[PDB]
């Protein structure tokens, strides 16, 4: 126990320095200036921002996960999770085997846990996949840009075979959508905003030219318009994507190519990958908590100068709480960003989870194409710039070294003032 302040500051002199600054408006204002500049580094920059790189990493991990395993994931049936006697249902722009389509055509077996994924769940997954791949390709906005949108996310699937009812679409009023040439408007709520969808149906007969299936089919085209592309929005689509896999927990059996890196175990249930899916869920959760600080930083602008009569840290210090909230929010953003990297960075991983990441998720088998590109060799590899993103996260963090100090200092000056400011 120290009786008085001189003994205390002889010892911890950096503290003496801190008190000197906390009583000096020009220092306090220079810190406030910095909080502004770093704030812009996080929530306004993109490539230079740990925060941004972390959000991108989380999303990419989720997408990558599905690129790696979705060709192997079995699926089928008819609507409402029912088995089918003879229903092939094909989803376009998916990382299928030697293909840019995944075919869901497993009959008789009952969709569910340790079974095929229902077409109902596949549809849900697919939407998120298409949205995310499109956003990734367009490029993600800086964190502050929470009012942007993707002009057009479009995808189709086709239905064929006896009794296949997956392409019958029921509407908001109740009437069935006209199977041949019909066209209509869903809306839904993504994020907190309303998004028009144009659903359109189309029948193609077996005789008709270029029908490479030689069987009469129904094609459903979904055209979404003005889809929000904020972090908060896309994280939510990732969340859907991964949770839909985890919840449906379908059966998967990979064809392990010789020479390559080796999948373990070779067949099973997708929610079996518990380490990987936890990581991906945690990453998304941390990134959401990361993007939440954006609203705390905005709510406490630090531009207005502080300072008439000489400055009095005991009474002139209302701004302090705001400053502290802001600095603490920035430091949380940084730490959460770091943490997102650490969850997946294979430098810290062991055994089967590490090999998933180095062997499969981190890799790509196209020849590098822009983000969001599905190709006929996309499957069995992440194809989502994980390794690059982990690297760019680090690079961004390393170029944040100064700012991080400034944040800490601001936080500490603010704290000192709140502290003096109490008493009253």
């Amino acid at each position: 126990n120290y009786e008085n302040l001189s003994k205390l500051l002889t010892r911890y002199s950096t503290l003496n320095t801190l008190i000197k600054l906390s009583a000096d408006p020009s220092a306090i204002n220079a810190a406030r200036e910095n909080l502004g500049a770093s704030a812009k580094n996080l929530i306004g920059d993109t490539k230079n921002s740990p925060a941004y790189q972390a959000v991108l990493l989380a999303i990419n991990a989720a997408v990558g996960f599905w690129n790696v395993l979705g060709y192997a994931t079995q699926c089928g049936g008819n609507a409402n999770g029912q088995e089918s006697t003879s229903s092939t249902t094909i989803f376009n722009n998916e990382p299928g085997y030697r293909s840019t389509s995944i075919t869901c055509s497993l009959n008789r077996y009952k969709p569910g846990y340790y079974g095929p994924m229902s077409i109902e769940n596949f549809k849900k997954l697919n939407e998120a996949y298409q949205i995310l791949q499109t956003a990734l390709n367009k490029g993600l906005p800086a964190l502050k840009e929470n009012n942007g949108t993707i002009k057009d996310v479009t995808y189709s699937y086709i239905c064929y075979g006896e009794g296949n009812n997956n392409c019958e679409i029921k509407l908001a009023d109740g009437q069935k959508l006209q199977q041949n040439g019909g066209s209509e408007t869903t809306t839904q709520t993504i994020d907190g905003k309303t998004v028009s969808t144009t659903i359109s149906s189309k029948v193609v007969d077996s005789t008709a030219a270029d029908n490479t299936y030689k069987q009469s089919y129904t094609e459903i085209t979904n055209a979404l318009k003005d889809v929000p592309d904020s972090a908060q929005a896309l994280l939510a689509q990732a969340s859907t994507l991964i949770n839909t896999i985890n919840t449906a927990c379908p059966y998967f059996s990979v064809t392990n190519k010789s020479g390559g890196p080796q999948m373990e175990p070779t067949r099973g249930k997708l929610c079996g990958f518990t380490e990987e899916i936890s990581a991906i869920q945690k990453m998304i959760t941390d990134a959401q908590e990361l993007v939440n600080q954006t609203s705390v930083i905005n709510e406490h602008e630090q531009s207005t100068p502080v300072g008439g009569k000489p400055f009095n840290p005991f009474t002139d210090a209302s701004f302090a709480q705001g400053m502290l909230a802001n600095a603490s929010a920035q430091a949380k953003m940084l730490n959460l960003a770091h943490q997102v990297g650490q969850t997946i960075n294979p430098d810290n991983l062991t055994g089967t989870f590490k090999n998933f990441v180095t062997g499969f998720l981190a890799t790509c088998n196209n020849k590098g194409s822009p983000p969001g590109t599905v190709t006929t060799q996309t499957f069995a590899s992440g194809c989502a710039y994980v390794e690059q993103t982990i690297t760019n996260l680090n690079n961004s963090i390393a170029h944040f070294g100064t700012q991080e100090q400034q944040i800490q200092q601001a936080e500490n000056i603010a704290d000192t003032l709140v502290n003096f400011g109490s008493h009253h």
Partner: nanobody
Amino acid sequence: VQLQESGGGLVQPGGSLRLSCAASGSIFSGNVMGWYRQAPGKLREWVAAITPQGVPNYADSVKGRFTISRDNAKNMLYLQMSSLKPEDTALYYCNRLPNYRSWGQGTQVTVSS
């Protein structure tokens, strides 16, 4: 979760020094590492940093003169200092980025005349 810096002391202007930091793997593994310094009268200043692949970057106050480096096999961080000036007088500290919130003892570096 440990940080230990060494390799400092008293040198002459233009002199050169090699600082070492032995870091725990919890700190070091798969992390950006970096060098920090605290001068009398002032607060901890960031000096340099290096990613796990080995890409370094430096504060404008030392660019050209200092060189950061890491030995991934042995959890070791090095700052190679050249053309030292009296302004570089400080305690030098090593940490990951973003920082583990308990710091090392540091290692004193003094430049004189």
